[PDB]
Design a protein around this ligand. Structure first.
Ligand SMILES: NC(=O)c1ccc[n+]([C@@H]2O[C@H](COP(=O)([O-])OP(=O)(O)OC[C@H]3O[C@@H](n4cnc5c(N)ncnc54)[C@H](OP(=O)(O)O)[C@@H]3O)[C@@H](O)[C@H]2O)c1
Ligand SMILES: NC(=O)c1ccc[n+]([C@@H]2O[C@H](COP(=O)([O-])OP(=O)(O)OC[C@H]3O[C@@H](n4cnc5c(N)ncnc54)[C@H](OP(=O)(O)O)[C@@H]3O)[C@@H](O)[C@H]2O)c1
Ligand SMILES: C[C@@H]1O[C@H](OP(=O)(O)OP(=O)(O)OC[C@H]2O[C@@H](n3ccc(=O)[nH]c3=O)[C@H](O)[C@@H]2O)[C@H](O)[C@H](O)[C@H]1O
Ligand SMILES: C[C@@H]1O[C@H](OP(=O)(O)OP(=O)(O)OC[C@H]2O[C@@H](n3ccc(=O)[nH]c3=O)[C@H](O)[C@@H]2O)[C@H](O)[C@H](O)[C@H]1O
Lengths: 287, 287
């Protein structure tokens, strides 16, 4: 089939593009900006893709390798443009043309259920955002809600803290290896090497709706650094800091949660729990 | 004949003014119980009430400690900004469209800068023009809401008002406000006299007119010209101090939109709408 990819030069979009091409699919990198709704509709009307995917957003930039970038005066316009408006333009136009859209969103719109409390099973697909501590998370929360108005037309995948075996400035493990102090908190995370094939399968199948799109279960920064130490780097040591210490040195807070992945597990029962998956990733990693 | 109207923002300055007028015209007005951002509660209320027409007079434009849009520039208020100035209005657009019920959305023309210099080649920002003013968090979000309303061009009436004026003094009224300000940044602007423009808005909603409309009285008026007309007609001892654009920017949390709106589209439908200077004369004579 023919796959039109927005964000195909980005970290994730490049990775997905490569896998679609190894699978024998035709990939078209979108030339239109997602927020240029008239150019998007011209491109979609002309290319006539079988599938559209969105790997776009504004999550770092000059001076800031993190979502702290969006807290600067003058960046709200880039935040809403790339992290809400562009994705909504793709939803409206893909829906009009009856072309399945995969939107790669975020689960960094919730806070909590990550304390191993016996009565808490994690945030669901239907749950409203309850984390408002970064401008990124605020805007993405509304994008996530708005995507529920396209439940039969758009696949809304909530990834978090994405990890690759290959080291990359964007990869959660690369980042935490680089940080002087670690705020260790159990969290739902996405191993892209494991879950990109699932995402492609879902888009091939025209599956629609919202899915929490993390590996089952919780892992902490300390558990990940402990595996790197215990598998490869016996000398490895790090300093811990609290949520409050971290808040003081960043421009924004950070989302910490468990996502309930029962919905994804109903379709894809072989996705590894996050600790089995991280053990696998760390075992294969170069430094 | 007389109809049933569901009003979001029925207790607000503009909403309560429109409610009273629809009631004076012998309509049935229901004040909405649901928050516009509570999409499930909105869908319940619309499906229950089965209104002939829905109207939105909602937004977040002031709050504790800040009688202006400067309120939205505080850390932690982006969530209120997007919730009330974008997401709630989009919830109303999606749901009213689903139920094929006409929606009037009271938007803003404070999404553009320029064309107010009396240059003969500049006839003002049109309905199709994209936002070009990004100097307040209010204007940035409202600009995206305006663009999003264009995806509902057959189902929603999107009216861009600016600097609303009432005969009746009120803290929200542009004339009350500039009378209250020690220093005036005098700039020619498109402005909306609500006493003259609300009856046009109600007619449009009765006719189920949809699309975007610039919704200011035709032409420009400056702060200095309004205050001069108040002095000469009502208050001969009135005096004020003038200040620059950059001097204003030094005292406020954000910049302000200054523009001309092209009102040819409205004037084509309603040739009798008073030009701003004729209308300001009517207003000041009634004060
Ligand atoms: C998911 O989905 C997104 C992909 O992330 P990532 O980590 O792969 O980030 P990334 O490496 O920054 O990739 C993002 C891509 O999206 C593009 N983009 C941003 N806004 C766009 C718009 N309005 N129109 C078209 N392209 C746009 C960027 O291209 P430009 O550099 O050309 O802006 C970039 O190629 C993130 O939010 C991620 O978590
Ligand atoms: O159009 C708007 C009207 O302007 P105005 O000058 O009349 O301002 P206003 O006097 O501040 O009126 C705004 C009204 O909208 C309501 N509102 C705000 N967000 C809402 C939401 N998410 N759901 C339901 N109601 C909401 C407010 O009610 P609350 O006070 O109950 O928030 C208020 O009654 C531009 O602000
Ligand atoms: C596109 C979005 O990117 C996001 O990354 P974010 O910009 O929050 O990454 P970091 O600030 O590096 O934060 C990554 C992690 O590092 C922790 N940390 C940070 C700095 C420090 O000095 N020490 C620490 O321990 C921080 O608490 C967080 O757990 C998320 O992936 C989100 O899932 C995804 O949708
Ligand atoms: C809901 C939105 O409200 C808005 O009002 P805004 O909050 O910008 O009002 P003010 O800050 O009082 O500003 C009102 C006017 O006062 C001027 N001024 C301000 C302070 C000062 O000390 N001296 C001055 O001369 C300012 O430049 C502006 O022209 C707009 O109506 C917009 O059309 C509407 O959609």
């Amino acid at each position: 089939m023919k796959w039109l990819i927005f964000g195909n030069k980005g970290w994730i979009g490049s990775m997905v593009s490569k896998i679609l091409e190894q699978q024998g699919e035709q990939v078209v990198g979108a030339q239109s900006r997602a927020d240029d709704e008239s150019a998007v509709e011209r491109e979609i009307s002309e290319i006539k893709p079988d599938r559209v995917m969105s790997f776009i957003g504004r999550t770092h930039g000059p001076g800031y390798s993190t979502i702290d970038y969006l807290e600067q005066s003058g960046k709200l316009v880039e935040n809403v443009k790339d992290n809400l408006y562009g994705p909504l333009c793709l939803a409206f136009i893909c829906q009009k043309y009856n072309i399945h859209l995969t939107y790669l969103g975020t689960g960094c719109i919730f806070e909590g259920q990550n304390n191993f409390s016996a009565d808490e099973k994690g945030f669901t697909e239907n749950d409203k955002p309850n984390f408002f501590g970064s401008s990124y998370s605020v805007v993405k929360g509304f994008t996530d809600r708005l995507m529920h108005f396209f439940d039969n037309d758009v696949l809304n995948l909530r990834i978090r803290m994405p990890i690759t075996i290959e080291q990359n400035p964007r990869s959660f493990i690369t980042k935490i290896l680089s940080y002087s102090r670690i705020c260790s908190i159990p969290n739902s995370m996405t191993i892209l090497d494991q879950m990109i094939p699932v995402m492609i399968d879902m888009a091939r199948n025209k599956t629609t709706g919202t899915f929490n799109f993390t590996n089952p279960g919780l892992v902490s920064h300390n558990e990940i650094l402990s595996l790197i130490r215990d598998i490869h780097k016996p000398n490895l040591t790090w300093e811990n800091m609290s949520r409050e210490q971290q808040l003081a040195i960043l421009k924004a807070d950070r989302s910490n949660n468990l996502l309930n992945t029962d919905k994804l597990q109903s379709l894809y029962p072989d996705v590894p729990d996050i600790l089995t998956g991280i053990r696998e990733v760390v075992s294969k990693m170069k430094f």
